[PDB]
RNA sequence: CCGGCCGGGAACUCAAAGGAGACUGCCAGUGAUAAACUGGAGGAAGGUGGGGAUGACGUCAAGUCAUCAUGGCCCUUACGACCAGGGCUACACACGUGCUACAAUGGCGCAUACAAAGAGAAGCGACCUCGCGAGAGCAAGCGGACCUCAUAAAGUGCGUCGUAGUCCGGAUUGGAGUCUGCAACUCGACUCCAUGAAGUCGGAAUCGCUAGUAAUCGUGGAUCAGAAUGCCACGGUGAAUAC
């Protein structure tokens, strides 16, 4: 087990943080756990909506949750009853007056959360993994994407030993720190157990 | 040792000792409370102290008084 | 008039002020033999002033803080050689040649994880 | 007189915010000292990186809290009216204590 | 030393006599990074050495150290599958480095009161070359003299 | 880590701020150089889990007792996971 | 020089030759020489006889040699006759004050047997 | 009021943001006129300047089902749950990693100088009074370049000790206590008085370190009500040697 998380080593360099509140030591743990609850809830209740990121920020006793998603229409719905329902329950969880926004992730096959969730969904619909991976690399390289690597792992095809079998195309410069590597990871709970899907997407060199 | 202010006994052991000296030393006492400093009124009673599995009887002599109960009930059996 | 040098050495900082005058040295409102001149190597604050001599040449009011004994002393040496812009860049030929204008940038190396100190690895048993 | 002390985790974000509060204040009122920087607090955390034994593998982390101090001198009513409700900062803690 | 040929770092000379030779002698004597203590011992011991021998300071030191410098020393080879102790000519910096190491080590061996007396008596015993460091030099020279047959 | 233990932890906190910080008053004020009676040393028949020295500070997410970090409120494992994803603000790798 | 018993110390500073008395260390010795009005660094040679029995008169006010040895012995016997933890522990010859006997109980337990 | 103490000054240290800087860039020589190497100047730094982060494809069916998640199996009036007491601290032994030592380059007493990095509200807790001391009482200031922790210690200058198991060493043990905590018996930490082992430089063997390094000296922090000789950091002094 030996590679650094390629989001974490780029946190001040190119990648931003998904939480951008300041807090002293008295409320740092409380704000942090409140963020675990709103991302847990808001991740479970938008499983069909293809959600990429949820960014929390707290401007002066009020949360401001931004849902980067690929299907904004299914998040908002017929006149946005679903949004006001979500800020009602996020205001229930965080205990502050909640705002909520939706940022449309166009080009959803270049986002690693959406790619890993895609391949994970296909693996738990019992399709063969080489199609899922290989289709994901092809259609991601089709639109921009100066590199992509996907990597499934663990008891693939229902075996009794676990393999990995990664694929990559293009250039994925993972030790370069100015590389805009969009990396994310999902787990596929199949009837044989968990299958881990990692995906790195190299977008640009700065 | 401990404690500039008061010694320690449990209140249930206080009441069992008061009733034990009032109505005479009749029976050994089930005490789990090893936390408890022997008082001078406890002299002559047979207080069985719990050693993890067994209540072992402790007959209180006059020089037990500056001590906890559990000193007279060893917990580990080494041979 | 009044001639300055910054002069630092392993967590020290020696402000060195020079006026022309006698051969006295005033360090933190204290003489040289009383600041650290009861201790090891007070010669090194006097080394820049033996390249051309200080006999009765210039009074220097110096003010050092941070560091230890030797750290403060090396800081004053570098401070005086930075403060010998009193005379022009003449001195800084020969003063370069003694190795005095070099900021000695040796600092204490950090302690690293799994090592007791900066490089002393903890001893390893049988094989 | 009126010290506004700003704290944030991102130095670009805090010097943007304090540049805005400086030009706001000395644009409306008068006599702003300047964004004095006041040492960064580096809090370091050294966690074990493995879910079991393996002490020697550790990961070191830090949170850098940046301060800035402004210290607005003139107590104009215009600068305290115009100074309130105008921050547009998200990760800044301000202290506007007199 | 596998690849890297090296330079060497320049030591500051002695603050009383300007002698880098004697500065390396107070570094050989120093223990636990305590240099002040070691230079106090060297100034006391060589001061009583200059008072006893009546010569001067560092020429009494230079004579007492001139009697303990090795000429040639043995050295292992392991070339032909055998252990040879070949004699080899000592470099001058190594020569007086070994001189000082033997003086200091033999002075730590002695049984007098203070370190300045142990080392003042060891340098005085090396001035008429009868001490312990001269027995170390004669021992080295018996090893390189017995095994002269390898050059 | 064993649901029971997390429930046990919530019991100890709830008793801790019911009784004590209100009757821990006793141990701060009456056990003192004032008179004495043995009484308030015996008025520690409070339910023993009102004592705040019986909270463990478990991880907020997994209830792990060891490796806790009071700043984040999490064990070292969830601190690293969340730190790398980017949910802990300001926190990044350190090197000096 | 025969103070507090058969103890005869001499040719040594008075703060330190008094430490030969079983039951006075450095503190109690500073207390004896301060209470008897004696300088701390005089020897017993170069010290008068009236001065010596002022030291006898001062050392008599603390429990020393015989009374202290039988007081200590009495304390240990009380513990071993109680049969408390400190007495069973004191009786078997194992460390009393809650120390480690898995290894490194070796003053109390003596040099290792097989 | 001799203290940056005040008015004041923004030079300087410094603080933190933004830039410049080091690239074989220049020179000489050697080299396929190539890569480059060796040496020189300038420069704070010279050749990946120092240190860190960064750990390729894979190996060990290496470690973790006890952080978590999880397939299957299994218990489901019990292998689940609540409680008190105990244990994880046991001790003929053996091994690992450390600390303190065996001393005079030192021990002790008196005076006196020079740090860096940190932490702090159910917290850090001055001053002053009491206690030999650990501490106690009243209690300012500080959510903190402002206050507190907090005196750096080795160093230096005097005096003493004088090669003794000693004024070394502090284990062990008795007594008396302080604090935290419902509660120090099993089973804390610290203090005071007394005790004063083993140990005089370590067999075979073995380990770390190439320069602010090893060695040695202190300080801080996390966990934590209280409990470090460990861990993670910080600075002080500061080597030897590399054919």
Curated annotation (Swiss-Prot), chain A:
GO molecular function annotation: mRNA binding; rRNA binding; structural constituent of ribosome
SUPFAM superfamilies, alphabetized: Prokaryotic type KH domain (KH-domain type II), Ribosomal protein S3 C-terminal domain
Presence of keyword Nucleotide-binding: no
Domain KH type-2: start-end pairs: 38-106
InterPro entries: KH_dom, KH_dom-like_a/b, KH_dom_type_2, KH_sf_prok-type, Ribosomal_S3_C_sf, Ribosomal_uS3_bac-typ, Ribosomal_uS3_C, Ribosomal_uS3_CS
Gene Ontology annotations of biological process type: cytoplasmic translation; ribosomal small subunit assembly
Cross-referenced Pfam families: KH_2 (PF07650), Ribosomal_S3_C (PF00189)
Record keywords: Ribonucleoprotein, Ribosomal protein, RNA-binding, rRNA-binding
GO cellular component, one term: cytoplasm
NCBIfam families noted in UniProt: rpsC_bact
Function of the molecule: Binds the lower part of the 30S subunit head. Binds mRNA in the 70S ribosome, positioning it for translation. Plays a role in mRNA unwinding by the ribosome, possibly by forming part of a processivity clamp.
Assembly with partners or alone: Part of the 30S ribosomal subunit. Forms a tight complex with proteins uS10 and uS14. With proteins uS4 and uS5 encircles the mRNA as it enters the ribosome, which may play a role in mRNA helicase processivity. Some nascent polypeptide chains are able to cross-link to this protein in situ. In collided ribosomes contacts ribosome rescue factor SmrB.
Membership in a protein family: Belongs to the universal ribosomal protein uS3 family.
Protein name listed in UniProt: Small ribosomal subunit protein uS3
Species name: Escherichia coli (strain K12)
Organism phylogeny: Bacteria, Pseudomonadati, Pseudomonadota, Gammaproteobacteria, Enterobacterales
UniProtKB/Swiss-Prot annotation, chain D:
A molecular-function term among this protein's GO annotations: structural constituent of ribosome
UniProt keyword Endoplasmic reticulum, yes or no: no
Entries under PROSITE patterns matching the protein: RIBOSOMAL_S10
Stored InterPro entries: Ribosomal_uS10 (IPR001848), Ribosomal_uS10_CS (IPR018268), Ribosomal_uS10_dom (IPR027486), Ribosomal_uS10_dom_sf (IPR036838)
Keyword Transcription: yes
GO cellular component labels: cytoplasm; cytosol; cytosolic small ribosomal subunit; small ribosomal subunit; transcription elongation factor complex
Keywords: Ribonucleoprotein, Ribosomal protein, Ribosome biogenesis, RNA-binding, Transcription, Transcription antitermination, Transcription regulation
A Pfam family annotated for this UniProt entry: Ribosomal_S10
GO biological process, one term: ribosome biogenesis
Highest taxon listed in the record's lineage: Bacteria
SUPFAM superfamilies: Ribosomal protein S10 (SSF54999)
Task of the protein: Involved in the binding of tRNA to the ribosomes. Part of the processive rRNA transcription and antitermination complex (rrnTAC). The complex forms an RNA-chaperone ring around the RNA exit tunnel of RNA polymerase (RNAP). It supports rapid transcription and antitermination of rRNA operons, cotranscriptional rRNA folding, and annealing of distal rRNA regions to allow correct ribosome biogenesis. In complex with NusB is involved in the regulation of ribosomal RNA (rRNA) biosynthesis by transcriptional antitermination.
NCBIfam families: PRK00596.1, rpsJ_bact
Subunit structure: Part of the 30S ribosomal subunit. Can also form a heterodimer with the transcription antitermination protein NusB. Binding of S10 to NusB is mutually exclusive with its incorporation into the ribosome. The rRNA transcription and antitermination complex (rrnTAC) consists of RNAP, NusA, NusB, NusE (this protein), NusG, SubB, ribosomal protein S4, DNA and precursor rRNA; S4 is more flexible than other subunits.
Family recorded in the similarity comment: Belongs to the universal ribosomal protein uS10 family.
Entry protein name: Small ribosomal subunit protein uS10
Protein source organism: Escherichia coli (strain K12)
UniProtKB/Swiss-Prot annotation, chain E:
Keyword DNA damage belongs to the record: no
Keyword Chloroplast attributed: no
Biological processes annotated in GO: cytoplasmic translation; negative regulation of translation; ribosomal small subunit assembly; translation
MF terms (GO), sorted A to Z: mRNA binding; rRNA binding; structural constituent of ribosome; tRNA binding
GO cellular component: cytoplasm; cytosol; cytosolic small ribosomal subunit; membrane; ribosome
Highest taxon above the source species: Bacteria
Keyword line: Ribonucleoprotein, Ribosomal protein, RNA-binding, rRNA-binding, tRNA-binding
Misc: The strain K12 sequence is shown. Has been predicted to contact the N-terminal domain of IF-3 based on footprint studies; exactly how IF-3 interacts with the 30S subunit is controversial.
Protein's job: One of the primary rRNA binding proteins, it binds directly to 16S rRNA where it nucleates assembly of the head domain of the 30S subunit. Is located at the subunit interface close to the decoding center, where it has been shown to contact mRNA. Has been shown to contact tRNA in both the P and E sites; it probably blocks exit of the E site tRNA. Protein S7 is also a translational repressor protein; it regulates the expression of the str operon members to different degrees by binding to its mRNA.
Subunit structure: Part of the 30S ribosomal subunit. Contacts proteins S9 and S11. Cross-links to IF3 and the P and E site tRNAs.
Similarity comment: family membership: Belongs to the universal ribosomal protein uS7 family.
This protein's name: Small ribosomal subunit protein uS7
Originating gene: rpsG
Residues of the full protein shown: 2 to 152 of 179
